Write an enzyme that holds these catalytic residues in place. Structure first.
Site, PDB file in Angstrom:
ATOM      1  N   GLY A  48       0.859  -1.308  -0.186  1.00 28.28           N
ATOM      2  CA  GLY A  48      -0.256   0.098  -0.052  1.00 28.28           C
ATOM      3  C   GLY A  48       0.674   1.270   0.030  1.00 28.28           C
ATOM      4  O   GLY A  48       1.987   1.257   0.243  1.00 28.28           O
ATOM      5  N   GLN A  49       0.255   2.301  -0.059  1.00 27.52           N
ATOM      6  CA  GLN A  49       0.823   3.646  -0.115  1.00 27.52           C
ATOM      7  C   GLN A  49       1.838   3.821   0.998  1.00 27.52           C
ATOM      8  O   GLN A  49       2.819   4.282   0.986  1.00 27.52           O
ATOM      9  CB  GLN A  49      -0.231   4.684  -0.477  1.00 27.52           C
ATOM     10  CG  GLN A  49       0.465   6.373  -0.369  1.00 27.52           C
ATOM     11  CD  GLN A  49      -0.624   7.386  -0.534  1.00 27.52           C
ATOM     12  OE1 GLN A  49      -1.133   7.376  -1.297  1.00 27.52           O
ATOM     13  NE2 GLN A  49      -0.560   8.373   0.339  1.00 27.52           N
ATOM     14  N   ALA A  50       1.192   3.718   2.159  1.00 26.49           N
ATOM     15  CA  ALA A  50       1.776   4.020   3.646  1.00 26.49           C
ATOM     16  C   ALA A  50       3.404   3.299   3.826  1.00 26.49           C
ATOM     17  O   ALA A  50       4.065   3.512   3.992  1.00 26.49           O
ATOM     18  CB  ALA A  50       0.923   4.076   4.518  1.00 26.49           C
ATOM     19  N   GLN A  81       5.856   4.036   0.705  1.00 20.46           N
ATOM     20  CA  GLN A  81       6.478   5.395   0.932  1.00 20.46           C
ATOM     21  C   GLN A  81       7.282   5.332   2.072  1.00 20.46           C
ATOM     22  O   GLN A  81       8.377   5.955   2.113  1.00 20.46           O
ATOM     23  CB  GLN A  81       5.255   6.605   0.788  1.00 20.46           C
ATOM     24  CG  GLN A  81       4.726   6.768  -0.265  1.00 20.46           C
ATOM     25  CD  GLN A  81       3.746   8.029  -0.153  1.00 20.46           C
ATOM     26  OE1 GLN A  81       3.436   8.634  -1.365  1.00 20.46           O
ATOM     27  NE2 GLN A  81       3.332   8.335   0.916  1.00 20.46           N
ATOM     28  N   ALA A 135      -7.983  -0.640  -3.399  1.00 19.18           N
ATOM     29  CA  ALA A 135      -8.836  -1.085  -2.774  1.00 19.18           C
ATOM     30  C   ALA A 135      -9.970  -0.042  -2.249  1.00 19.18           C
ATOM     31  O   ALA A 135     -10.826  -0.633  -1.347  1.00 19.18           O
ATOM     32  CB  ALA A 135      -8.413  -2.028  -1.487  1.00 19.18           C
ATOM     33  N   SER A 137      -0.104   0.183   6.234  1.00 15.31           N
ATOM     34  CA  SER A 137      -0.827   0.838   7.096  1.00 15.31           C
ATOM     35  C   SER A 137      -2.251   0.065   7.649  1.00 15.31           C
ATOM     36  O   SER A 137      -2.531  -0.980   7.297  1.00 15.31           O
ATOM     37  CB  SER A 137      -1.529   2.386   6.369  1.00 15.31           C
ATOM     38  OG  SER A 137      -2.491   1.690   5.338  1.00 15.31           O
ATOM     39  N   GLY A 178      -7.031   0.324   2.423  1.00 12.33           N
ATOM     40  CA  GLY A 178      -7.798  -0.897   1.820  1.00 12.33           C
ATOM     41  C   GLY A 178      -6.698  -2.101   1.494  1.00 12.33           C
ATOM     42  O   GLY A 178      -6.862  -3.288   1.658  1.00 12.33           O
ATOM     43  N   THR A 179      -5.570  -1.498   0.726  1.00  6.82           N
ATOM     44  CA  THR A 179      -4.422  -2.414   0.624  1.00  6.82           C
ATOM     45  C   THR A 179      -3.687  -2.905   1.794  1.00  6.82           C
ATOM     46  O   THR A 179      -3.383  -4.105   1.921  1.00  6.82           O
ATOM     47  CB  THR A 179      -3.832  -1.858  -0.640  1.00  6.82           C
ATOM     48  OG1 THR A 179      -4.459  -1.474  -1.477  1.00  6.82           O
ATOM     49  CG2 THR A 179      -2.619  -2.785  -1.041  1.00  6.82           C
ATOM     50  N   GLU A 196      14.990 -13.258  18.038  1.00  7.60           N
ATOM     51  CA  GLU A 196      15.170 -12.755  19.221  1.00  7.60           C
ATOM     52  C   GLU A 196      14.575 -11.677  19.605  1.00  7.60           C
ATOM     53  O   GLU A 196      14.340 -11.159  20.637  1.00  7.60           O
ATOM     54  CB  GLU A 196      16.887 -11.974  19.061  1.00  7.60           C
ATOM     55  CG  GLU A 196      17.772 -12.904  20.188  1.00  7.60           C
ATOM     56  CD  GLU A 196      19.229 -12.100  20.298  1.00  7.60           C
ATOM     57  OE1 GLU A 196      19.921 -12.333  19.187  1.00  7.60           O
ATOM     58  OE2 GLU A 196      19.691 -11.682  21.184  1.00  7.60           O
TER      59      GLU A 196
END
Ligand SMILES: CC(=O)O[C@@]12CO[C@@H]1C[C@H](O)[C@@]1(C)C(=O)[C@H](O)C3=C(C)[C@@H](OC(=O)[C@H](O)[C@@H](NC(=O)CBr)c4ccccc4)C[C@@](O)([C@@H](OC(=O)c4ccccc4)[C@H]21)C3(C)C
Ligand SMILES: Nc1nc2c(ncn2[C@@H]2O[C@H](COP(=O)(O)OP(=O)(O)OP(=O)(O)O)[C@@H](O)[C@H]2O)c(=O)[nH]1
Ligand SMILES: Nc1nc2c(ncn2[C@@H]2O[C@H](COP(=O)(O)OP(=O)(O)O)[C@@H](O)[C@H]2O)c(=O)[nH]1
Ligand SMILES: [Ca+2]
Ligand SMILES: [Mg+2]
Ligand SMILES: [Mg+2]
Ligand SMILES: [Mg+2]
EC number: 3.6.5.-
Lengths: 319, 426, 441, 53
Positions: C10-12, C15, C99, C140, C144-145, C254
């Site tokens: 997704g975008q978040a 990026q 999405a 994120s 939606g994605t 760990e």
């Protein structure tokens, strides 16, 4: 305009604070579940502190200090005093107390027997029973966690009447953790000769409603004992208030927090015949005397609310 | 590349659609010949949403012009930007629709509807990823109302998984052509309830009152009303035409604005609206206050009579984004009574740097308010006043319709009104 | 040497992944064209940075990373960015329509049609690993994605790589930068489906990053670029132990051993200090005690909450720069006497400390000032359940009226998955409460 | 307070301070994904049936 919500309809103090805010023309009351508020007068139990300070563009203030219950519950107040080095178990202004579960049951017997071998009357509370020997105190509790506290056998008795009493002090702590002591206290006096319980729930013989205020009580201390309320009692009261609140300050302070807190407390004291003050309990949701409602609630709006949300001689003693 | 196919049907739909394309062609630097002559790459970054790129770096609107008589579309082709439209995308008949929903929906319109779908199919086949359609039309006439809703039903059948969006002009007795407009609007509203995802409700009564009371136009014309609409249509599509994060496509807008499928009728608003003083610079607090005022909204409904389900606000121009957030959260916190408490953070805000051609700053309002039921109430009242005496029905029964279809349309809109009243009390 | 594969969804996620690999290259001396003049073993090697970078015969250091998004505009900026030469096209996967902020659309409708392609590209990176240890997944909660497709990918990764560990970096939704009203829905839906497939998840609340950028960086309206450069610093502090020589948190297992005693309560709180504006000419360089004291200020946490009213299960201190163990112990002793730090009764009251001598790297032209020492604290405190409580409350408000539910049912999801996901969150809040919790008067 | 597990290298060191002691298979996922796809096809068939009427 500022916004606020009411979550405790049973609070006589903040029912008066809310109508004062609704009298300045700059405060609007929202529905109790509207999250876009500046001020929450929250519920007494299970206040959702975790949902405060997450509204973008809103400074949010709540009338309770999260974590202050450690000071306002009888079992946890004893544990706080005996375990905090700021107070120590050698604390001189708090009666000897033990937390026992129906555990300090064995430590209580060692101290009880050591002075019965050498007067030792105790009290049970959390439903009050005052016994002279330890066997009777433990059986009543097994009928929730309780505390056994040394009963003040030599109280200061008012004359005429030979009567017991206790002192209620109201303390306001603002968002900057300034400690304000309301200059007006009340003495919930017993109307029977020493009668062991002085709660206002338990009449009107010597003063209206078994309530003597500071002006009359100070006048009595001058005539009968040749001293003042400030010297004999109020210095110890200010000392106890500071000790308790400064002890838990790192735990409950909201100085660098995403929301702010203030709270009104009710401190209950007792005075022995040697003019020594003892701390009984601390009340987190206290009521007020009928005469002092208007002055104190106005002081709450001026000191705790308007200091954060400004509008368009102080009655408190800053400690 | 998420292309939108535009359709304009009937007199009102084509005249409003024409002004819309004139307005956004100027914003994207497209001259009436289809040549780009702008000075910013932001004008071309998302230009494929509404324009096809032909040979020679010319941009052709992805628009289809529909009518049952040639009059209005002749005037469009002779208009200022008339040469920018693809000539094949002019689909018209000759008989007209006589302000009759039945003629547009069942008889005259049925004869032409397949030709329109042939052009729609041709524009869709050249879409890298078609996201949906937008229809411009009125509900009070015959072609835009009757045939427009016939087009929507047949487009949904051929593209069931695409978004359908409409700009629908609601009739009003104060700005009226014929007395059968409540009949045509009631028949159309039910079609929109079933077959659109977003409908911008544009009340001709509100447009008139804004021209008269606010703009101080003593004798407003249809051209004056269409001027407001094109400026509003430009505002509500800014998020689709320029780079942005919020409501960037038709389906994301629908997900944020429509909590219940049938309640998808929006009140639009624009700011500023001032008489002609006009050179005075506008501030952010002034844009926000006007944008939320009822006098700036175009559905002729008082939002204080209902509650907002969702709100979309778009600010255009160079302004303080911090100051935009402050005033937005100001009107939102000062009037929290008119926002539903069961949809948290239901007011979304977007900012576009490129302002309209003539303004330094502007704001567009998009509200899904339960107060829109007042519009459907008015139409229902006017429908019933005539239908109780079966007045003017012969125009419709003469086209094969039965009285029962009117009874069902009456019940469907009263149901729609009741559904809004359900959530206004919630 | 055991390799780690990063997945950005997704975008978040994309990026943020972009901002991390830029910072990684600056920390490891990797130029935008992939060349690394300090790597003397050309075309191969088993150094610590090779856990995140493969090598070609020409000397290019290629991230072990996959980027996946359901619309191409965000990943296209990776294809044309400064570090475009770093990746080959197989690592960048794009769809044509996203999405639409709808979990069901990302998980069921569009996810079913692209999941096999994503797994094929991931398998290509896995086959280039001599001893793959697991995956780091960036996404994120609200998209939606990021929510829908991630929970599907995490299910298949547990099937195809059952022995491998999975760590998440998740963006908690904040209305100040949120793009959708249904983000509480997508957050609960993806937490429910992913909970049994993730071994350790680092949540980052955009509201916290936003306020740190305003207060500490003096940015009046922070952008995603501002937020992502700060997030990439915290992420770099957490992954540094896998990319440099050391002994603490040297493999993905760990992280679970040191931070997650209970498998379900796998959301450590991250706290970072110091965050200092680059616009001021001179800043007083904070000491080891001062930056360690700042780790217990709520204003520096990645999720705003009050650890004073919770209990700790584990606590790691990750220092970077001029730090010696003597100063850390002196700081811990001072802090423990003055702070409310209470552990659960079945865990030791202590700190696992890691020091990397190289100071934190800052992006040239960024908003963060170069500092001489920094620290990231990873503590597993029950106070982070406040973030679940806020989220589940917003869920409850909308779901009581079934608002927006039709969008999810229309994509093939059932209404029962909503309540099923909500009951799991109610159980999760109960697990935190069991672990960390002791009128008119 | 005690310091244990002190490991040192050229790029740093690490240690511990103690202050006080005390899944669904592929077919199962495929069924869920196909079940949601069937529900989408059923809703679309009802729509087209409704439009045919
Ligand atoms: C929209 C707008 O601004 O309307 C008002 C009205 O309240 C606004 C406020 C203004 O300041 C005021 C008053 C102007 O004084 C201004 O000098 C001025 C602009 C900016 C002109 O508008 C432009 O040029 C814009 O860039 C524009 N494109 C067109 O409208 C095509 Br011509 C546009 C707007 C929004 C989105 C995209 C593009 C329009 C106007 O006639 C004047 O409106 C009208 O008289 C009018 C009459 C009936 C209905 C609607 C408007 C105007 C003129 C006089 C030329
Ligand atoms: N910190 C940070 N948060 C982001 C960034 N991009 C988006 N977000 C957040 O992510 C949420 C929106 O989800 P996205 O990742 O943009 O959506 P997506 O995963 O691409 O899913 P779809 O667009 O619906 O296909 C919002 O809460 C945003 O605030 C970013 O670059 N940095
Ligand atoms: N705002 C606006 N409304 C119009 C215009 N032309 C017609 N109308 C309205 O549309 C309705 C008549 O529909 P019309 O478009 O003329 O019928 P059609 O051509 O058969 O679709 C009436 O309510 C008119 O008030 C216009 O140019 N602008
Ligand atoms: Ca090498
Ligand atoms: Mg006409
Ligand atoms: Mg996306
Ligand atoms: Mg009491």
């Amino acid at each position: 305009m500022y916004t606020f919500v009411v979550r405790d309809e049973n609070s006589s103090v903040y029912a008066e604070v809310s109508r004062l805010l609704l009298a300045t023309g700059q405060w609007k009351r929202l529905r109790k579940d509207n999250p876009r508020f500046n001020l929450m007068l929250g519920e007494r139990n299970r206040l959702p502190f975790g949902r405060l300070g997450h509204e973008p563009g809103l400074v949010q203030l709540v009338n309770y200090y999260r974590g202050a219950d450690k000071l306002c519950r009888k079992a946890s107040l004893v544990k706080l005093i005996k375990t905090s080095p700021e107070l120590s178990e050698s604390c001189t202004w708090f009666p000897e107390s033990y937390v026992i579960y129906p555990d300090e049951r064995e430590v209580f017997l060692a101290a009880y027997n050591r002075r019965r071998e050498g007067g030792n009357v105790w009290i049970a509370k959390s439903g009050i029973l005052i016994s002279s020997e330890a066997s009777e105190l433990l059986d009543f509790i097994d009928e929730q966690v309780h505390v056994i506290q040394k009963y003040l056998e030599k109280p200061l008795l008012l004359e005429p009447g030979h009567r017991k009493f206790d002192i209620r002090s109201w303390v306001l702590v603002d968002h900057l953790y300034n400690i304000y002591l309301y200059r007006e206290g009340v003495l919930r006096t017993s109307s029977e000769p020493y009668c062991h319980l002085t709660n206002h729930c338990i009449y009107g013989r010597y003063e209206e409603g078994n309530e003597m205020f500071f002006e009359e009580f100070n006048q009595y201390l001058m005539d009968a004992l040749n001293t003042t309320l400030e010297n004999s009692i109020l210095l110890q009261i200010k000392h106890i208030i500071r000790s308790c609140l400064m002890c838990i300050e790192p735990a409950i302070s909201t100085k660098h927090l995403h929301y702010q807190s203030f709270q009104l407390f009710g401190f209950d004291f007792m005075v022995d015949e040697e003019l020594k003050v003892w701390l009984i309990e601390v009340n987190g949701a206290p009521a007020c005397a009928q005469k002092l409602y208007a002055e104190l609630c106005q002081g709450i709006v001026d000191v705790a609310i308007s200091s954060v949300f400004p509008l368009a001689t102080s009655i408190f003693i800053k400690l | 590349m998420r292309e939108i196919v535009h359709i304009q049907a009937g007199q009102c739909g084509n005249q409003i659609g024409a002004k819309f394309w004139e307005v956004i062609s100027d914003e994207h630097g497209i001259d009436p010949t289809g040549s780009y002559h702008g000075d910013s790459d932001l004008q071309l970054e998302r230009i494929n949403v509404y324009y096809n790129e032909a040979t020679g770096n010319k941009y052709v609107p992805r628009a289809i012009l529909v009518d049952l008589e040639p009059g209005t579309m002749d005037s469009v082709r002779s208009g200022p930007f008339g040469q920018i439209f693809r000539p094949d995308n002019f689909v018209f008949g000759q008989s007209g629709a006589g302000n009759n929903w039945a003629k547009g929906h069942y008889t005259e319109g049925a004869e032409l509807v397949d030709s329109v779908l042939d052009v729609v199919r041709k524009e869709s086949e050249s879409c890298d990823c078609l996201q949906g359609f937008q229809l411009t039309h009125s509900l009070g006439g015959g072609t835009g109302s009757g045939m427009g809703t016939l087009l929507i039903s047949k487009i949904r059948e051929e593209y069931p998984d695409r978004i359908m969006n409409t700009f629908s002009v609601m009739p009003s007795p104060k700005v009226s052509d014929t007395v059968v407009e409540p009949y045509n609007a009631t028949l159309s509203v039910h079609q929109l309830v079933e077959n659109t995802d977003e409908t911008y409700c544009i009340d001709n009564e509100a447009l008139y009152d804004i021209c008269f009371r606010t703009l101080k136009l003593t004798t407003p014309t249809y051209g004056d009303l269409n001027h407001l609409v094109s400026a509003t249509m430009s505002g509500v599509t800014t998020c689709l035409r320029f780079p942005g994060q919020l409501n960037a496509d038709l389906r994301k807008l629908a997900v944020n604005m429509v909590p219940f499928p049938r309640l998808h009728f929006f009140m639009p608003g624009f700011a500023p609206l001032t008489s002609r003083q006009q050179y005075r610079a506008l501030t952010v607090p002034e844009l926000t206050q006007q944008m939320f005022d009822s006098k700036n909204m175009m559905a002729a409904c008082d939002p204080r009579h209902g509650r907002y389900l969702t709100v979309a606000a778009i600010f255009r121009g160079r302004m303080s984004m911090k100051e935009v957030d402050e005033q937005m959260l100001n009107v939102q916190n000062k009037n929290s009574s008119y926002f539903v408490e069961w949809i948290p953070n239901n007011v979304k805000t977007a900012v576009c740097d490129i302002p309209p051609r003539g303004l330094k700053m502007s704001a567009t309002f998009i509200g899904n308010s339960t107060a829109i039921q007042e519009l459907f109430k008015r139409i229902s009242e006017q429908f019933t006043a005539m239908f109780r005496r079966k007045a003017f029905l012969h125009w419709y029964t003469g086209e094969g319709m039965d009285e029962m279809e009117f009874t069902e349309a009456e019940s469907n809109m009263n149901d729609l009104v009741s559904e809004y009243q359900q959530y206004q009390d919630a | 040497m055991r390799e780690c594969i990063s997945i950005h969804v997704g975008q978040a996620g994309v990026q943020i992944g972009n901002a991390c690999w830029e910072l990684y290259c600056l920390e490891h001396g990797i130029q935008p064209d992939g060349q690394m003049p300090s790597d003397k073993t050309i075309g191969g090697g088993d150094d610590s940075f090779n856990t995140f970078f493969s090598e070609t015969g020409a000397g290019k250091h290629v991230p072990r990373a996959v980027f996946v998004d359901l619309e191409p505009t965000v990943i296209d900026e990776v294809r044309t960015g400064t570090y475009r030469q770093l990746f080959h096209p197989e690592q960048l996967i794009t769809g044509k329509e996203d999405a639409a902020n709808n979990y069901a659309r990302g998980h069921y409708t569009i996810g079913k049609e692209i999941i096999d392609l994503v797994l094929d590209r991931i398998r290509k990176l896995a086959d280039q690993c001599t001893g793959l240890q697991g995956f780091l997944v960036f996404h994120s909660f609200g998209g939606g994605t990021g929510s829908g497709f991630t929970s599907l990918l995490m299910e298949r990764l547990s099937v195809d790589y059952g022995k491998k560990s999975k760590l998440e970096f998740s963006i908690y939704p904040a209305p100040q930068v949120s793009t959708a009203v249904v983000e509480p829905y997508n957050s609960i839906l993806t937490t429910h489906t992913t909970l049994e497939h993730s071994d350790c998840a680092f949540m980052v609340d955009n509201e916290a990053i936003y306020d740190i950028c305003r207060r500490n960086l003096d940015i009046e309206r922070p952008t995603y670029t501002n937020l992502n450069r700060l997030i990439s610093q915290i992420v770099s502090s957490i992954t540094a132990s896998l990319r440099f020589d050391g002994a603490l948190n040297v493999d993905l297992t760990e992280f679970q051993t040191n931070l997650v005693p209970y498998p379900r309560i796998h959301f450590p709180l991250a706290t970072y200090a110091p965050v200092i504006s680059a616009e001021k000419a001179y800043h007083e360089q904070l000491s080891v005690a001062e930056i360690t004291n700042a780790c217990f200020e709520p204003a520096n946490q990645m999720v705003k909450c009050d650890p004073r009213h919770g209990k700790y299960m584990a606590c790691c201190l990750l220092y970077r720069g001029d730090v010696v163990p003597k100063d850390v112990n002196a700081a811990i002793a001072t802090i423990k006497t003055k702070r409310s730090i209470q552990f659960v009764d079945w865990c030791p009251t202590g700190f696992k400390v890691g020091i990397n001598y190289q100071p934190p790297t800052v992006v040239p032209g960024g908003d963060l000032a170069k500092v001489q020492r920094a620290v990231c604290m990873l503590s597993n405190t029950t106070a982070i359940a406040e973030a679940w409580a806020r989220l589940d409350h917003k869920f409850d408000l909308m779901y009581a009226k079934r608002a927006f539910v039709h969008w999810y049912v229309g994509e093939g999801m059932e209404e029962g998955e909503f309540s099923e996901a909500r009951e799991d969150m109610a159980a999760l809040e109960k697990d935190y409460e069991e672990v960390g919790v002791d009128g008119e008067e | 307070m005690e310091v244990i597990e002190l490991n040192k290298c050229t790029s740093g060191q690490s240690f511990e301070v103690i202050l006080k002691p005390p899944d669904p298979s592929l077919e199962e996922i495929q069924k869920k994904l196909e079940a949601a796809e069937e529900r989408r096809k059923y809703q679309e068939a009802e729509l087209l049936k409704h439009l045919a009427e």
